[PDB]
Amino acid sequence: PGRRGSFVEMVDNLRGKSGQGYYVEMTVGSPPQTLNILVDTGSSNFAVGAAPHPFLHRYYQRQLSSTYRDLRKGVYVPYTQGKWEGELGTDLVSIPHGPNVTVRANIAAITESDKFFINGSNWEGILGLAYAEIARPDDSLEPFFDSLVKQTHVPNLFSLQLCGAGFPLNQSEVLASVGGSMIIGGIDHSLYTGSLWYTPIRREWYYEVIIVRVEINGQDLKMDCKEYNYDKSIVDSGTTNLRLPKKVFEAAVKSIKAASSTEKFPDGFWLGEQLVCWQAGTTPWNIFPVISLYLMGEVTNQSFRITILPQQYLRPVEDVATSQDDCYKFAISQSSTGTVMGAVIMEGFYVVFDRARKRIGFAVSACHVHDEFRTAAVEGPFVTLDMEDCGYN
């Protein structure tokens, strides 16, 4: 059958890009104050700029909201990239291109920050979509999505289609372009092709999953599967890269270098610091390998795999000389806090965060970037044994 799209009001409600984040429009307070908010499945606090900042064009003004409630408590959140400090309160919140509901939610009003806001990102806050376990100050601060589900009839699920352009976008182009969809309360069948395959959420804190095998162009990386999930593996729209545990990163880059060895790239490229450029239209996608991550299935002893292309893990960037060349940075990097399946990997797929059934679904995205010879893929099943042993304790 033809796939129908039943969530038209929410399709195309995101803007942004992998490097600076994808955001959704929200309103806070009464009368409504419109703010653009970063969608972050890797944290659990809803927070907004609430004081002037050189990178903010607007911010939440609590004194102008008749529905604001002061919780008289400070909050601090330290992320990988940056950090902020603020003041807790609650207020009425809505998503204009979302469900037609208004809920009272916890809001951290950011008063101080460091390396948090991004110049020209066009967002002024963050929506942490993960679970209360990782909320600051503690798990008693109910996250936004929990409030939404408790106060309304919205089903306990959301899905994300992050759309990478495959070329650079300046601030103006981001403003005028659609960056994807966040479907709150459902799955929109127009956003993917093929089947949805589900992996269990191991524990409800981050959106933690278990990787059981890694291949580079079909070649098994052949590491003990616990290495892939040391000390966790998470699905995170708030991180740009695919980040891998140090040892896995070292093995994967050695394999990616070997597969792409018809061209030599500088160390700075592989360290994700330096861009590489090709003459317009000549990027040699075919010399770079595909990367497959096998994920634990819902059926005992079954796994499935998701496969990405270099069009996902090579992130388009503007040249230092703004020429006609096509330039990119390598968007796979090392981590000391486990695997992070960031935005550049989520760009290949429509990802379903099925909280009700404690599982994450993946399907090939209808907006993934590819070429005439290869596409991203989601395939299965594979008979995989002792998959629970892949989890790190």
Ligand SMILES: CC(=O)N[C@@H](Cc1cc(F)cc(F)c1)[C@H](O)[C@H]1C[C@@H](OCC2CCCCC2)CN1
């Ligand atoms: C690059 C990075 O830090 N991304 C942030 C969002 C983000 C985006 C951005 F543009 C600027 C930022 F400062 C932050 C994500 O949350 C990452 C961070 C890491 O979780 C940390 C814990 C710390 C304890 C509370 C829960 C979160 C995994 N998910």
